[PDB]
Design a protein around this ligand. Structure first.
Ligand code: CDL
Ligand code: CDL
Ligand code: PLX
Ligand code: PEE
Ligand code: PEE
Ligand code: 3PE
Ligand code: ADP
Lengths: 49, 99, 459, 54, 98, 321, 347, 54
């Protein structure tokens, strides 16, 4: 112990950390799925593959 | 006085602590290696290697190519009695003047 | 060009992630490596330019300027590490970051293939320079110097932006290759006169032209040593490069519109040399010598002949190297005695011999001494001006005489005579300062050995 | 050095422009903050826009 | 256009000129501001009644509602100014400068 | 919630609900070397209130980082001992000390108000910002400080102390100046032994003529002599039987308490006007010295980053914080 | 003011602006303007003092006069056309009345004095909300009715705004008055491009709003309302001063920063319409704004002004409240020049 | 032997009510630190009434 008063950010807010990581993972997987669906729809409409 | 101001510090001499100082850093080892890297890289690498690289850069400006082409053209034109330098750059037949 | 651009953007995080005592070493080593890499741009073709991609291209005019910039960065690092010993780590890294950003902007400026991207980059070069001047200048006048520099450049350059967007609307493209191939003559009209004026005036203010040059002594005298080195060596060459680039679409209006600028350049060359004769400040003398040399370059570009452009390119490279070396020498003297007065320190030949040798060589290169590339460029410009008219020889001879006079006046005042008795803190010259002078002077002599590398596309 | 560089090249381009800008800035910013005054200005502007603009 | 519309528009113009020319009192200018909306109400209802725009007959009432909302706002600001200075004179509103 | 703010207020946290009618602000005052400190200790312990010793130099050091005091060059730049030895210094030590002590008292009053509004427990302070000016007048009438220093003090005090609630109880301990000097001589500390009689008299005059008349109008004022102050049982009994409904505390509401709590929990907003651009030679610091001292303070162990993000003092999980 | 009352007043201001921006009826647009003003006055008077009361009084008088003129224009347009839909106005007199009313609401010259007066009078949060949102709404109305705008009147008022903003900002030392004159100049630029490209008007609006939010939030973070108060920020938190310096450089239009994009696009668009004199004058006049931005930058970050002694306690203490989206606004206001072609998405 | 940094003269140059003072602007004064002006000593002037004798 160093500080005379417990700092507000003394320990990680695990709820916020978990929500942040989950939001990042969800956004990345959603973006990958959206890009795949966009490529498939573009190919289907233009009659490429 | 109008402020609580520091006095102007005395000039710091690098030779006082380190008599054999190269003038790069206060730390002796850091200063020595700064001198070494500067001298090695700059002088040796850049100067010598870049100078020989520029000296032996290939003839991409086609100076010698132009000279050989000129030699061939002069030989051919003086062998056949043609003028060495043509009067026109382009073909007057291919040029169509206005009426 | 990415093989050179990306290493600078990697110099940035390396500078910010290196240790506190290793920033100078790492920056110098990797700047020298980047310069060596950029030495490969000198292999140019005789027919056309090096068109790497749709965005960047290199030419016999851009290549020497890029090599000069990449070589100038580590010398600036050496001088900055000289004068920034007591700074904090964060501020040292910020200064190095400003230098790196300036080099990156200059590289992209010299290699930009469109006029609007070139405008954006050559205007972006102002911010790091202004920050450097007004933040790490020593005296009070740095703020006024920065204001003058910024406002001169911007008041010159904004009509250039308007003219560039107008030209894009009229012709369809600002790509340099397209505007060179699809160029059409400029008829004698008021609108064309003012378009020519917008472009030429922007680059003339950048040059600077005589009568538009006060910002140059203001900024050069009051900027730190690295800022002074970059201002004279490279930042003055943006105007000449731009004029040699834009004048493709400004014909035949350049035959008639160039008279006032030619007269200003010649007479102000004479006047600034005479001013150099009577300068009580060494930095001001160097700055006015720079003004005279760039006035000669302006004369070359305005007369606009294949012999004038080669001389302009050679003189620009030579002036960059020589002015950087002179500023470094004057800065070492200032770091000795903490004053810029020329007559304060005397007998410096008997107090510091090898620095006297460096001063002698720098002064001999400052005046046109054969076979130096300074003389090569000046002689080509003088011959082209002679073909233009036969009294330009009178003006050029007067300028050469005054140039020799003030160069040797500076040398004799600073180095010869008897030393000042009460100045007793002139320590022996450092290995770092001697190496800085050697790295300034040797490439100039090697360029003298091989002169076709700096004679431009017209060679 | 003195007459041209330090006096007249400074007087013509940079100093005169700065003086004009300072004078205009003082003129614009020198207001007593009176709603009566600048609402009279509003009335004049409205009349001018109605009449002189068609 | 008939002369009735001319008179109503002239009344609006007069009330607008009155507001733009203060004398001493803020209350007098508030009264000038209230008259402009009265002229607007009269003009709007004269136009709507003449063209038999049946569904537009509710517009003047909304106009009156927001008119008296503005009047309430002006009265509140006037009481605050009068508490601050002792009079509703607009000369006292000079702390802020342009 | 989880931190006081508008969200907590709209959730329903109310200061009036939190209070227990024993939440009182009591300030004990007196001349130099009185029994005011011991009286405050006894009153605080008997009434179960939190005691706040006098806010001298390094109080902010005690409340931030680790409780240990920092260097005088980094916290305060003033010396009470030097003020005693050479009161008429040419470096502005006297007014630097006075302004720093006023800022420290302002900080302590903000802390006490925050504690009272967040816990409901009363606070007994050994001195307040309302009593601080007596030493300013004592310095001014003795020629120690200047009229410009007094004017700057008045401006800062106005714009700062105009925003807080006066104490519920003001307890003044009256001790005659000869007795003050006798106690000083008995204590034997040389610097305070150098205190002159006129300086002590000016403090008492300021207390008697300005502070006590000013505090009487706002709320109750209790005055005791040495013997009366020594017997704290009667003092606490007198406090417990005080009838008063003319103070601003009864007029305070939930919204006013919300605004006051939002103000006092923000320590940088409390000290906002303690540094106003008034360039007195006593309190102004040059650019170079300011930069050097700021660098030294940042080089202090647990001061480079925020409290939760200082690895050198044993903070882990920084990369996930 | 109760927090619930404050948030409901903010919601009502936003409701009025959204009603203006979604309505297709002139009466509903006027209703939105009235609701916005009615809920905006107490926001100005939130921190009660004579200066705030005077600022609110001046703002109310100006906006009430503008609303009266706007309703008169609506009625006159209805008389000659019988139409309530917001389209190209059918009467030139009504169009002139509407143009003058919307210019007065925006603060375009010569209807500008209330902008510096009120901005100085009110606090920093009130000034931020005022500038941003109260420019957001009338510009929407003008963009809707652009095709009937008189180019001469609009460009005259725009150039006057640019010149007057430059000169006023040159003279001022107060940060709020400086921000107000900057707002006047930026509104001038936007309304100058308005009669040609409402897309460029919207682009300039977005960039100006981002830069203004960043600057105001930096001022709130530093709690500085004057030049000398800002001169002490380098001794407490030097990062904020550097961020303010780069934001000031961006607001001056210096490349390669975000502030150059609106000026560049507007100059290009006006050049496409064979306008050269106006773009050149507008480009040259902005150097005054750049000058006083640079003067502010000299005092705050590029030089070190003297500090005081209680700054040591300020060092000891840490900032509590966290600004929301401040880093995002600082990044978006300086480093979005390479993302210029997104204005097509804005189209 | 050190970089010049602004002093009290520079700060007082930048610390006026406005830049570029004139006579009127010199008569002007900067606003209060907390934007709260001192209250004015206005007189309530209560109505005085004679209740009686008639
Ligand atoms: C005043 C005396 C005077 O006219 O001196 C001209 C004289 C120009 O030299 P010159 O050799 O006499 O001119 C040759 C011919 O007389 C004129 O040349 P020409 O007859 O062959 O026709 C070309 C002429 C075409 O003529 C026109 O276009 C006339 C219509 C007006 C053009 C205005 C252009 C302004 C451009 C910006 C200038 C900023 C300053 O071009 C110009 O006028 C060029 C204008 C820009 C000149 C240089 C600008 C930098 C001046 C630096 C010092 C400033 C102090 O000096 C100056 O222009 C600067 C000093 C006087 C101010
Ligand atoms: C309805 C459902 C949601 C309700 C949320 C609020 C209620 C719950 C929380 C609560 O009780 O808040 C009370 C709290 C008031 O408590 P207080 O103790 O009186 O605090 C006084 C000051 O706020 C204390 O001063 P401050 O320093 O805390 O200032 C807070 C506030 C002060 O500023 C404002 O309130 C202005 C808000 C608009 C800013 C400009 C937006 C521009 C958008 C342009 C177009 C983009 C497309 O915001 C800022 O200073 C920075 C605003 C940055 C906005 C960036 C927008 C980017 C888009 O309310 C607020 O802070 C405002 C809430 C506004 C809600 C409506 C939606 C916005
Ligand atoms: C009598 C007095 C004479 C005194 C002369 C002193 C010099 C000694 C004699 C000259 C040296 C012997 C001749 C060497 C010569 O041949 O090499 C030169 C070449 O010198 C170098 O090219 C000079 C390099 C210059 C560039 C240095 C860059 C290093 C980094 C500097 C960066 C800053 C530069 C910024 C602007 C680019 C000339 O090129 P070239 O005759 O055909 O070479 C022949 C080989 N071939 C046939 C295959 C072509
Ligand atoms: C209708 C179109 C014309 C409208 C206006 C067009 C503007 C043209 C370009 C304007 C450039 C902007 C720079 C001028 C800013 C105003 C300068 C000023 O106010 O003068 C006073 C000012 C001193 O006062 P302050 O520094 O503010 O502080 C005083 C402390 N007690 O004078 C100065 O020293 C500042 C000088 C600024 C740099 C000098 C000007 C640079 C060159 C100007 C011409 C450009 C040459 C073009 C090439
Ligand atoms: C005060 C007096 C100021 C004198 C200096 C001029 C600077 C003020 C700028 C105001 C504009 C004045 C010149 C206007 C020229 C112009 O607009 O026309 C150019 C032409 C117009 O053609 P159209 O409109 O398509 O006509 C079709 C014909 N059927 O367009 C162009 O070529 C683009 C030119 C850009 C405008 C250039 C204006 C400035 C002139 C160059 C001066 C450079 C000054 C640099 C400053 C550095 C030293 C101070
Ligand atoms: C459309 C959404 C717009 C934004 C809505 C939210 C605004 C208020 C919240 C952000 C406040 C500033 C950011 C820094 C907060 C620091 C305090 C902290 O610890 O925050 C933790 C937080 C993660 O918390 P968590 O709840 O997990 O977030 C995911 C959602 N549940 O950490 C963070 O939130 C940090 C990352 C924030 C993301 C960057 C900001 C939004 C950018 C969106 C992309 C578009 C960029 C341009 C925006 C303008 C144009 C649209
Ligand atoms: N504003 C002030 N200016 C100068 N000195 C002060 C100030 N406030 C307190 N002091 C000094 O701090 C000390 C406070 O202790 P004191 O009042 O003697 O009570 P105690 O005897 O219980 O310690 C005194 O020596 C006093 O001189």
């Amino acid at each position: 112990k160093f500080y005379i008063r417990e700092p507000p950010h003394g320990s990680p807010d695990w709820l916020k950390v978990g929500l942040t990581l989950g939001t990042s993972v969800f956004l990345w997987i959603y973006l990958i799925k959206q890009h795949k669906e966009d490529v498939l729809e573009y190919k289907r409409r233009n009659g490429l593959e | 006085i109008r402020l609580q101001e520091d006095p102007d510090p005395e000039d710091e001499n690098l030779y006082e602590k380190n008599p054999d100082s190269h003038g790069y850093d206060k730390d002796p080892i850091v200063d020595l290696w700064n001198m070494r890297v500067v001298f090695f890289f700059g002088f040796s690498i850049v100067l010598v290697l870049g100078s020989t690289f520029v000296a032996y850069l290939p003839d991409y400006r086609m100076q010698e190519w132009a000279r050989r082409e000129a030699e061939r053209l002069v030989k051919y034109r003086e062998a056949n009695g043609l003028p060495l330098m043509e009067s026109n750059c382009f073909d007057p037949n291919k040029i169509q003047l206005p009426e | 060009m990415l093989k050179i651009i990306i290493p600078t953007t990697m110099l940035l995080p390396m500078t910010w992630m290196s240790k506190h005592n290793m920033i100078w070493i790492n920056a110098t080593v990797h700047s020298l490596l980047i310069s060596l890499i950029s030495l490969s741009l000198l292999n140019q073709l005789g027919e056309n330019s090096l068109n790497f991609s749709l965005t960047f291209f290199s030419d016999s005019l851009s290549a020497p300027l890029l090599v000069l910039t990449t070589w100038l960065l580590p010398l600036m690092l050496m001088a900055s590490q000289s004068h920034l010993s007591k700074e904090t780590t964060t501020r040292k890294k910020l200064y190095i970051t400003m230098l790196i950003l300036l080099q990156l902007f200059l590289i992209m400026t010299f290699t930009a293939t469109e006029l609007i991207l070139f405008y954006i980059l050559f205007e972006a070069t102002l911010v790091p320079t202004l920050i450097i001047i007004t933040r790490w200048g020593n005296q009070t006048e740095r703020l006024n110097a920065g204001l003058y520099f910024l406002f001169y450049t911007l008041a010159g350059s904004l009509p250039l932006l308007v003219a560039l967007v107008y030209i894009q609307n009229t012709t369809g493209s600002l790509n340099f290759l397209i505007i060179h191939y699809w160029s059409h003559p400029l008829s004698n009209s008021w609108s064309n006169i003012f378009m020519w004026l917008a472009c030429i005036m922007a680059f003339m203010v950048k040059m600077p032209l005589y009568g538009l040059h006060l910002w140059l002594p203001k900024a050069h005298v009051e900027a730190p040593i690295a800022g002074s080195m970059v201002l004279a060596a490279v930042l003055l060459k943006l105007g000449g490069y731009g004029m040699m680039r834009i004048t493709t679409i400004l014909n035949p209006l350049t035959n008639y519109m160039a008279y006032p600028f030619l007269m200003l350049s010649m007479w102000g060359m004479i006047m600034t040399s005479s001013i150099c004769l009577r300068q009580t400040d060494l930095k001001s003398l160097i700055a006015y010598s720079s003004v005279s040399h760039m006035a000669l370059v302006i004369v070359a570009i305005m007369i606009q002949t294949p012999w004038s452009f080669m001389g302009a390119t050679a003189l620009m490279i030579a002036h960059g190297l020589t002015s950087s070396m002179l500023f470094c020498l004057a800065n070492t003297n200032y770091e000795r005695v903490h004053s810029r007065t020329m007559i304060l320190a005397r007998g410096l030949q008997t107090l510091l011999p090898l620095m006297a040798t460096w001063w002698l060589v720098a002064s001999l290169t400052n005046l046109a001494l054969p076979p130096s590339i300074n003389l090569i460029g000046e002689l080509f410009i003088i011959t082209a001006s002679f073909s233009w008219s036969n009294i330009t020889i009178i003006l050029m001879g007067m300028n050469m005489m005054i140039t020799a006079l003030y160069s040797l006046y500076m040398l004799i005042t600073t180095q010869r005579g008897k030393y000042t008795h009460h100045i007793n803190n002139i320590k022996p010259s450092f290995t770092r300062e001697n190496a800085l002078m050697a790295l300034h002077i040797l490439p100039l002599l090697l360029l003298t050995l091989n002169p076709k590398m700096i004679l431009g596309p017209l060679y | 050095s003195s007459l041209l560089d330090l006096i007249w090249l400074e007087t013509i381009l940079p100093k005169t422009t700065s003086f004009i800008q300072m004078k205009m800035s003082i003129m614009v910013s020198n207001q007593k903050g009176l709603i009566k005054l600048y609402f009279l200005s509003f009335l004049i502007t409205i009349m001018i826009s109605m009449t002189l603009f068609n | 256009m008939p002369l009735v519309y001319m008179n109503i528009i002239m009344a609006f113009a007069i009330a607008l000129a009155g507001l733009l020319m203060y004398r001493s009192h803020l209350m007098s200018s508030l009264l000038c501001l209230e008259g402009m909306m009265l002229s607007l109400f009269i003009m709007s209802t004269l136009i709507i009644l003449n063209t038999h725009f049946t569904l537009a007959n509710m517009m003047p009432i909304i106009l009156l509602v927001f008119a008296a909302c503005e009047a309430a706002l002006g009265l509140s600001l006037l009481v605050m100014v009068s508490n601050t200075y002792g009079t509703d004179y607009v000369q006292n509103l000079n702390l802020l400068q342009c | 919630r989880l931190q006081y703010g508008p969200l907590a207020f709209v959730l329903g946290e109310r200061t009036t609900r939190k209070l227990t009618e024993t939440s009182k602000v009591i300030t004990v005052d007196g001349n130099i070397c009185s029994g005011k400190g011991r009286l405050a200790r006894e009153i605080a312990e008997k009434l179960g209130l939190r005691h706040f010793p006098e806010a001298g130099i390094h109080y902010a050091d005690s409340t931030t980082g680790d409780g240990k005091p920092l260097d005088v060059q980094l916290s305060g730049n003033c010396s009470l001992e030097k003020f005693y030895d050479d009161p008429k210094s040419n470096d502005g030590n006297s007014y630097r000390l006075q302004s720093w002590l006023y800022a420290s008292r302002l900080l302590q009053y903000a802390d006490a108000l925050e504690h009272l509004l967040s816990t409901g427990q009363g606070v007994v302070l050994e001195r307040s910002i309302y009593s601080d000016f007596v030493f300013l007048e004592a310095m001014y009438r003795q020629g120690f400080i200047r009229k410009q220093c007094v004017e700057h003090y008045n401006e800062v005090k106005k714009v700062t102390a105009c925003e807080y609630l006066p104490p519920h109880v003001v307890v003044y301990v009256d001790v005659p100046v000869p007795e003050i000097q006798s106690r000083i001589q008995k204590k034997g500390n040389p610097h305070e032994m150098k205190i002159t009689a006129a300086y002590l008299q000016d403090i008492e005059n300021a207390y008697k003529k300005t502070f006590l008349p000013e505090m009487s109008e706002k709320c109750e004022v209790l005055q005791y002599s040495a013997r009366e102050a020594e017997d704290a049982e009667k003092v606490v009994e007198d406090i417990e039987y005080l009838k008063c409904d003319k103070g601003p505390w009864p007029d305070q509401d939930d919204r006013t308490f919300h605004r006051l709590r939002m103000l006092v929990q923000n320590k940088l907003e409390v000290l906002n006007y303690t540094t106003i651009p008034v360039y007195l030679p006593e309190i102004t610091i040059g650019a170079h010295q300011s930069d050097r001292v700021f660098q030294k303070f940042t080089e202090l162990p647990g001061r480079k980053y925020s409290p939760g993000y200082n690895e050198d003092v044993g903070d882990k999980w920084i990369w996930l914080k | 003011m109760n927090p619930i009352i404050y948030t409901t007043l903010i919601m009502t201001v936003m409701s009025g602006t959204m009603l203006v921006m979604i309505s297709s009826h002139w009466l509903l647009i006027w209703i939105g303007f009235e609701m916005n003003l009615l809920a905006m006055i107490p926001v100005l008077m939130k921190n009660f003092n004579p200066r705030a009361t005077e600022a609110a009084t001046k703002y109310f008088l100006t906006q009430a006069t503008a609303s009266m003129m706007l309703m008169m224009a609506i009625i006159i347009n209805l008389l000659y056309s019988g139409q309530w839909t917001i389209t190209k106005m059918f009467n030139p007199v009504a169009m002139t009345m509407m143009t003058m009313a919307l210019a007065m609401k925006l603060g375009l010259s010569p209807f500008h004095f209330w902008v510096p007066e009120v901005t100085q009078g009110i606090s920093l949060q009130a000034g931020l909300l005022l500038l941003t949102w109260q420019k957001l709404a009338p510009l929407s109305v003008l963009c809707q009715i652009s095709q009937s705008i008189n180019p001469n009147l609009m460009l005259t008022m725009a150039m006057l705004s640019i010149l007057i903003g430059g000169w006023g900002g040159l003279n001022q030392t107060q940060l709020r008055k400086i921000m107000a004159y900057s707002s006047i100049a930026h509104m001038g630029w936007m309304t100058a491009v308005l009669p040609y490209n409402t897309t460029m008007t919207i682009l300039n609006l977005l960039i100006y709003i981002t830069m203004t939010l960043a600057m105001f939030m930096l001022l709130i973070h530093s709690s500085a309302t004057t030049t000398l108060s800002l001169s002490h920020t380098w001794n407490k938190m030097p990062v904020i001063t550097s961020l303010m310096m780069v934001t000031l450089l961006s607001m001056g239009g210096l490349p390669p920063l975000s502030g150059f994009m609106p000026k560049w696009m507007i100059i290009q668009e006006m050049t496409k319409n064979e306008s050269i004199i106006m773009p050149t004058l507008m480009a040259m006049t902005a150097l005054l704004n750049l000058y006083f931005y640079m003067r502010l930058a000299y005092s705050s970050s590029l030089t070190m002004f003297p500090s005081t002694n209680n700054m040591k306690m300020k060092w000891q203490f840490e900032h509590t409240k966290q600004m929301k989206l401040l880093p995002t606004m600082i990044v978006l206001s300086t480093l979005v020049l390479p993302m210029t072609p997104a204005l097509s998405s804005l189209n | 032997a050190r970089q010049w940094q602004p002093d009290v003269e520079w700060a007082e140059q930048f610390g006026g009510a406005v830049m570029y003072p004139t006579k009127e602007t010199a008569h002007w004064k900067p606003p209060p630190w907390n934007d709260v002006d001192p209250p004015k000593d206005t007189l309530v002037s209560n109505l005085t009434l004679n209740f009686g004798p008639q």
